[PDB]
């Protein structure tokens, strides 16, 4: 299959409660492999999977610099707490070749700046991000980012996948069943369950007489079980007597072929 390595970094200011917290978590697909938390104090970066502290420590300081600068760019007071988030990493195909790289930032939950897919240019969301853009253009930051994403990222993803091949390259199919719950004399809920799957990407749909029921289906967010696997369900309300007109459809990478399920 295709795979991704991604770091998700959060920096959050807290005036009057010390310097901003910095946390960086690294994933291969839906598997965490590292955490660095400036508030831990426990041994610096913690492995999170069985398969450079200094860069993480310096990244803490850089993110605090960023937060200072952003407060200024938005004319904000020193009293409020603000959030800077970063995502970066690479996507590779089944042959290990680069599909694309990522390096983007959000401030207070809004997109701020992103490295374009070319790995050479920036997209800035507003006049504040244009300041960052100019600074980064002047210092040739995109060239450094491109070198990391095309080189280090892809190389280390390939090495991790090989070391961790029994887990990272194993897709676990969903276990599936349909439940039935009357709501009244006139109607009942059918709920299609998918349990125990990895990775998290899945498609679960209901059809009625072969027509998609997108508007009428309640689909819960895919959720972690805590054992590496994920869970999801999709529900529809159906007239009593008409249950056999409804089919649940499941697509997942660990399935030899897609499932069609009905009640009983």
């Amino acid at each position: 299959g295709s795979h991704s390595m991604r770091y998700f970094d959060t920096a959050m200011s807290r005036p009057g409660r010390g310097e901003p917290r910095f946390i960086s978590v690294g994933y291969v697909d839906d598997t965490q492999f590292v955490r660095f938390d400036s508030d831990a104090a426990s041994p610096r970066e913690e492995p999170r999977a069985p398969w450079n502290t200094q860069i993480f420590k310096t990244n803490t300081q850089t993110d605090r610099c960023s937060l200072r600068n952003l407060r200024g760019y938005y004319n904000q007071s020193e009293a409020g707490s603000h959030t800077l988030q970063s995502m970066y990493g690479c996507d590779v195909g089944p042959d290990g070749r680069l599909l694309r790289g990522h390096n983007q930032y959000a401030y207070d939950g809004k997109d701020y700046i992103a490295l374009n897919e070319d790995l050479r240019s920036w997209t800035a969301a507003d006049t504040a991000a244009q300041i960052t853009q100019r600074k980064w253009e002047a210092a040739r930051v995109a060239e450094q980012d491109r070198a990391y994403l095309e080189g280090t990222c892809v190389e280390w993803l390939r090495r991790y996948l090989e070391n961790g091949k029994d887990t990272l390259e194993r897709a676990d199919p969903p276990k599936t069943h349909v439940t039935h719950h009357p709501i009244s004399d006139h109607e009942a809920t059918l709920r299609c369950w998918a349990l125990g799957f990895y990775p998290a990407e899945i498609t679960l749909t209901w059809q009625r007489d072969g027509e998609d029921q997108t508007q009428d289906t309640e689909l819960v967010e895919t959720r972690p079980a805590g054992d590496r696997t994920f869970q999801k369900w999709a529900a529809v309300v159906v007239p009593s007597g008409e249950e056999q007109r409804y089919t649940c459809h499941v697509q997942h990478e660990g399935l030899p072929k897609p499932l069609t399920l009905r009640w009983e």
Binding site: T58, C65, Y88
Partner: peptide
């Protein structure tokens, strides 16, 4: 064995 990226100040 983690290799994070050097960040740059916004």
């Amino acid at each position: 064995r983690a290799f994070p990226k050097k960040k740059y100040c916004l």
